[PDB]
Ligand SMILES: *[C@@H]1O[C@H](CO)[C@@H](O[C@@H]2O[C@H](CO)[C@@H](O)[C@H](O)[C@H]2NC(C)=O)[C@H](O)[C@H]1NC(C)=O
């Protein structure tokens with residue numbers, strides 16, 4: 370999960386490829402104290 | 414999946430850590446004859 | 458064996474349907490090696506020398 374400078378987006382683990390987040394590159398996970406509580410632009 | 418004496422629950426593969434069963438730690442698999450049929454306390 | 462053959466990429470339908478033949482195949486596979494105890498077994502050749 371990568372910040373942009375034209376907000377988070379997706380990038381690959383071996384190349385700087387900013388890309389909007391979808392369901393096909395992330396997985397559900399239990400919350401942690403270190404995670405970012407974003408509440409103005411919810412990801413799809 | 415596990416039973417305990419305080420309906421099933423979940424534990425990890427390396428520690429006896431009882432916790433309620435979620436979808437975050439299970440997957441859907443086609444039925445097999447060896448399984449346990451339950452019709453009283455359906456997990457979420 | 459059911460879960461290991463699940464792990465190799467064989468569907469659960471045929472494992473649900475074809476237990477007897479795979480059991481016979483495994484049994485005859487482990488039974489064929491007793492009569493193969495001869496020079497053809499390279500393991501015996503290595504043990505021998
Ligand atoms: C986002 O909100 C969650 C929910 O409150 C925060 O997680 C809690 O943080 C406190 C601070 O130590 C812990 O005592 C709680 O145990 C945490 N809750 C859980 C469920 O883990 C989280 O810290 C917040 N994120 C940020 C960056 O502040």
Ligand SMILES: *[C@@H]1O[C@H](CO)[C@@H](O[C@@H]2O[C@H](CO)[C@@H](O)[C@H](O)[C@H]2NC(C)=O)[C@H](O)[C@H]1NC(C)=O
Nearest residue numbers: 443444445446447448449450451469470473474
């Ligand atoms: C749970 O219910 C299923 C559905 O009836 C049972 O699956 C069948 O069980 C019979 C005998 O118990 C077998 O002859 C069938 O081949 C099974 N069919 C399938 C699709 O699995 C299952 O056995 C039941 N389990 C328990 C513990 O009662």
